[PDB]
Design a protein around this ligand. Structure first.
Ligand SMILES: *Cc1c(COP(=O)(O)O)cnc(C)c1O
Ligand SMILES: *Cc1c(COP(=O)(O)O)cnc(C)c1O
Lengths: 340, 338
């Protein structure tokens, strides 16, 4: 028996997958499962998402993409954070699509002697982060077009989460036209992350790549989509102490993902009732006040930090002055992952 | 090659152990290696510490305790965060000391059908968290003393006042002995109290932080050597103006909090470059100005540690403590030993 765990509801994930598949329509559905499926356990999550419609998967690193192939994912897989200094050839060998994020990346790929290399051009559409920018488009498209063994499956841009969006699309379309003018068909393109996907059907293109929504969380406040949250972070009270007040100790500290800054900003839920966190969050635990403990909370009681039978990830996120993306990624350390 | 890693200096840890072993004198040295040895990798760290003098090891959970036995640690082991509902019996069968942190824990142990159970009494000396409080002294000591299959090896408490907690701890110790509990080996010193209160060493000291080379009291040195370095390789350098920015392969899913925005910089070739903009899930951006030093993709960016700001400095910049920063590197971060 574990005192600290995250409950991962796989059925909720399948549901979310079905809801996203219906919403995508004719567009392909790429499931973004980087960061170990947003901390939900990609080894279990990805197969469920695959079994319910996902046309492809998107991850950040070479290692994550390779892990997907390891568990048996046979769908198209895209990786966008790697450098020519790494063994990217190992990914190519595993049928992993690689994003061209800079001229140097394009160069390393063209100079790679492999039969057929699938690549997707990451376009810097204005954020000035990663990706090939306007001044480099000409050279890169020309170089990739001249490479026999390279197949440019398309291009994509990451609508940084923002007006801003439409300005990015204009630049992206300028790049796509320039690419095709160079002989690059760019058959499958995508720009939609969860927020854009759930609000801009005009930007579906040939493929959409939402991440957050698969885990049942809403990207924009005020919007309903019938999603089912999949993660619940909960601990079992280790000790109930009487000071006629009482406090309870819950076996979770900053070493487990509970920020020290969360002090005095939230409550956990025991049997559906809230109890405010009090005092300093320590390395292995934090304390909550039971008041006169009228409901008779005892050691062993289940305390929901966020999730089922408690406050959802979004509420907890706002209490912590952050976003739900970060809260689901927080549970770590002694926290054990349990499915459904 | 990995774009994001923690470099763990095992020789530094051996060094820190020797230092702490010296300062401990006749007092037993129990190294705290809970939380995977403060995120330094207990499977490699604990053996080094044991090989250099540690008399015992302290961890929080049964699983962490069992993990020490699994790696072959033969020293005394104490575990202080568990409940009667867990299979603590399996831990007793592997010679793992259990802390009595409430009357119910004492009850469970007393009712456990085992021949010899080594226990340490966790004393609530005023903090009012876990541990047995003064109102419970009597009942617990008297019950444990009447159970011959249990060996009360001693008692301990945790410092937040300090002297105040000590006064209380002493009272409990006296009552326990009055009840027939000898309490041969007691302890209260964590890293800060150990380095400054030689009068509180007692029979055993319980340092954690110091073994990893970090100083608890920002004021003076003790000759420790920091053991961890968190660093990344620039993935791309982009022109934004004639200014440039560089993308660093680490986000809040890897341990870099979104709140860290505008609070820090990374060190590249000994010089600092400010993080700017929003911290995303997989990466953050730094400002290079006109990039006078020609930083290129592939460059080594030290977040904290060797060739960068030490953990304490980084912790202050992010409004936290060094204990938390060494626990932060996670996600795609790959641990490497040097
Ligand atoms: C994280 C990420 C996504 C997923 O975004 P959500 O907002 O979670 O839908 C999509 N594309 C890229 C390039 C990403 O890094
Ligand atoms: C974490 C812990 C320690 C170690 O403390 P440092 O401040 O790192 O030396 C000692 N005792 C207990 C009970 C602990 O939980």
């Amino acid at each position: 028996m574990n005192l600290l765990t995250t409950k991962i509801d796989l059925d909720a994930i399948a549901h979310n997958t079905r809801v996203l598949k219906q919403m995508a329509g004719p567009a392909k559905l790429m499931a973004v499962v980087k960061a170990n499926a947003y901390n939900h356990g990609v080894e279990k999550v990805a197969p469920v998402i695959a079994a319910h419609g996902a046309d492809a998967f998107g991850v950040a690193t070479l290692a994550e993409a390779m892990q997907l192939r390891d568990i048996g994912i046979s769908q198209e897989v895209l990786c966008w954070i790697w450098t020519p200094e790494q063994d990217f050839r190992a990914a190519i060998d595993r049928n992993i699509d690689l994003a061209v994020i800079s001229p140097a990346h394009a160069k390393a790929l063209i100079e790679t002697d492999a039969e057929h290399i699938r690549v997707s051009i990451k376009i810097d559409s204005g954020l000035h982060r990663s990706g090939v920018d306007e001044q480099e488009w000409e050279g890169v498209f020309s170089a990739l077009a001249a490479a026999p063994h390279i197949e440019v499956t398309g291009m994509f841009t990451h609508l940084a989460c923002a007006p801003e969006t439409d300005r990015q699309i204009i630049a992206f379309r300028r790049a796509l036209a320039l690419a095709r003018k160079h002989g690059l068909e760019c058959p499958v393109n995508h720009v939609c992350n969860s927020p854009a996907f759930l609000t801009r059907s005009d930007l579906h293109m040939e493929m959409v790549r939402p991440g957050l929504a698969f885990y049942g969380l809403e990207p924009v406040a005020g919007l309903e989509h019938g999603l089912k949250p999949a993660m619940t972070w909960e601990a079992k009270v280790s000790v109930v102490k009487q000071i006629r007040g009482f406090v309870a100790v819950v076996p979770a500290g900053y070493a487990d993902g509970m920020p020290r800054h969360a002090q005095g900003k939230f409550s956990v839920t025991i049997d559906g009732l809230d109890y405010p966190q009090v005092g300093r969050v320590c390395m292995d635990q934090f304390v909550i006040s039971l008041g006169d403990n009228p409901h008779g909370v005892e050691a062993g009681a289940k305390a929901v930090i966020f999730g089922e039978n408690g406050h959802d990830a979004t509420d907890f996120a706002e209490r912590l002055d952050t976003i739900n993306y970060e809260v689901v990624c927080r549970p770590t350390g002694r926290t054990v992952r349990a499915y459904v």
